[PDB]
RNA sequence: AUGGACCGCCAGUGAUAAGUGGAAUGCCAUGUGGGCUGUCGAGCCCCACGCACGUGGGG
């Protein structure tokens, strides 16, 4: 929230919503001027999408200790089809969704991290299931 | 008023140059169209004349 002078805007986050320079033609016209704010629930949906698939293009810059490279990387599984098996209810389906964690270091997710990530440095590896479920960072 | 409403795929362009289908070839040999046969009274009207048998002029 600090170190970022310009807000990206709701239209840049949500998918199917024409961001600032996009051509506005399809997916509802949004002039990026007085944009109708998304409800929080749909905001969570678009959020989860962006953490998964996300534009690999350069975006809003963030100076971090003197370094501003508005360049942004690509999503971790950008452009692939995920396969989740189902049952008759969400219960047994979610249970079959659990991948077998190989024996290794205990791991924790991004939303389970007691530490706030430092942008610089190496994203350390993670043998735990939270690192092979692509939710460590 | 519909995963919809609004909405160009589009600006340019020789298919070009050349070329015998050519040499030879009888549809030939045979055949009645025949018998019968003469072309010899309604015609519609007006008028004139008449011996009322018909005669004559005009359409």
What can you see in these coordinates?
This protein is mainly alpha-helical. It has four helices and no strands. The chain is globular, with a radius of gyration of 18 Å. The two termini are 19 Å apart. The relative contact order is 0.11. The chain binds one RNA strand of 59 nucleotides through loops. This is CRISPR-associated protein, Cse1 family. The PDB classes it as immune system. Keywords: CRISPR-Cas, Cascade, immune system.
The amount of beta strand, in percent, is: under 5%
Count of separate DSSP helical elements: 4
Q: Can you tell me the overall shape?
A: globular
How many runs of DSSP E, i.e. beta strands? 0
Give a short account of the largest sheet. Answer: none
**Series of secondary-structure elements, N-terminal to C-terminal:** HHHH
| Content-based structural category | mainly alpha
* Distance N to C terminus: 19 Å
Helix fraction? 10-25%
Query: For the CA atoms, what is the radius of gyration?
Result: 18 Å
Organism: Thermobifida fusca (strain YX)
Protein name: CRISPR-associated protein, Cse1 family
């Amino acid at each position: 929230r600090e170190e970022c002078p310009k807000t990206s805007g709701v239209n840049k986050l949500a998918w199917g919503r024409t961001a600032g320079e996009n051509q506005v033609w399809l997916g509802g016209h949004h002039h990026d001027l007085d944009p109708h704010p998304l409800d929080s629930a749909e905001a969570v949906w678009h959020l989860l999408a962006t953490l998964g698939y996300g534009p690999s293009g350069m975006c809003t810059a963030r100076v971090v200790r003197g370094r501003s490279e508005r360049n942004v990387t690509a999503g971790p599984l950008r452009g692939t089809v995920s396969y989740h098996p189902l049952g008759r209810t969400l219960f047994e389906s979610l249970i079959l969704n659990i991948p077998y964690p190989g024996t290794g270091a205990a791991d924790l997710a991004f939303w389970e991290q007691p530490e706030l990530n430092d942008p610089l440095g190496l994203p350390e590896e993670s043998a735990g299931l939270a690192g092979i479920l692509r939710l460590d960072h």
